[PDB]
């Protein structure tokens, strides 16, 4: 799931000690063409009873249920993707009345209602990169929480890490070999990892990339 490539990319950037450079030129590592197609804009952990609900930046919503099934509702509020335990996938609509999914659809709508009522949309002011017209939406593969962060792994290979204390977030893509950093002031910047290696970066980003490698190691080992 591209995790191995992610780990190697992070190992390489971190080994270069990017914050120990004197004349840091972080802006030279920016590549707005590498902005992600998707990131997680909201989430709610109700895994003690139902599962983990989330919103993607395109306003689609999803749930990773406790039975290890996944349901996605598109931003049109009708189109569905349903992914079974084995990875089997169906493309359906709510309006067609899929009898056997109506319960799970209802649960997803309750997740959707809670998120709309209560939660802020991360990166709301940023236009995501356009994907291929015939590309399916990714699902949440896995997630875990530490004392300091939530780690979210999408089926397109992206790894997202949200830090609780200061609301800073990383979105890592192994296909672009890029990192998006959303800072304490909500500033959204996308960098090529190889260019961070060459040009350097601030202590704040470097520290978070070190933590990211530890998290990616955990994702890799828990497979």
């Amino acid at each position: 799931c591209h995790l191995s490539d992610m780990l190697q990319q992070l190992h390489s950037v971190n080994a270069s000690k990017p914050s120990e450079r004197g004349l840091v030129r972080q802006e030279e590592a920016e590549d707005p063409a590498c902005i992600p197609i998707f990131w997680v804009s909201k989430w709610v952990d109700y895994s003690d009873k139902y599962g983990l609900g989330y919103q993607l930046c395109d306003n689609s919503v999803g749930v990773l249920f406790n039975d290890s099934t996944r349901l996605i509702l598109y931003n049109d509020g009708d189109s569905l993707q349903y992914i079974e335990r084995d990875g089997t996938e169906s493309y359906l609509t709510v309006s067609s009345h899929p009898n056997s999914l109506m319960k799970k659809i209802t649960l997803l709508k309750y997740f959707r209602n809670y998120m709309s009522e209560h939660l802020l949309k991360a990166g709301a002011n940023i236009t995501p990169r356009e994907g291929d017209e015939l590309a399916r939406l990714p699902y949440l593969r896995t997630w875990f929480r530490t004392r300091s962060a939530i780690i979210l792994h999408l089926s397109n290979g992206s790894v997202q890490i949200n830090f609780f204390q200061d609301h800073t977030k990383l979105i890592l893509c192994p296909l672009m070999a890029a990192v998006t950093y959303i800072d304490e002031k909500r500033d959204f910047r996308t960098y090529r990892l190889s260019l961070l290696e060459e040009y350097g970066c601030c202590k704040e980003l470097a520290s978070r990339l070190r933590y990211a490698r530890t998290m990616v190691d955990k994702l890799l080992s828990s497979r």
Binding site: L119, A122, N162
Partner: peptide, 7 residues
Amino acid sequence: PPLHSTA
């Protein structure tokens, strides 16, 4: 840890 994203 928290049970939801930023409210």
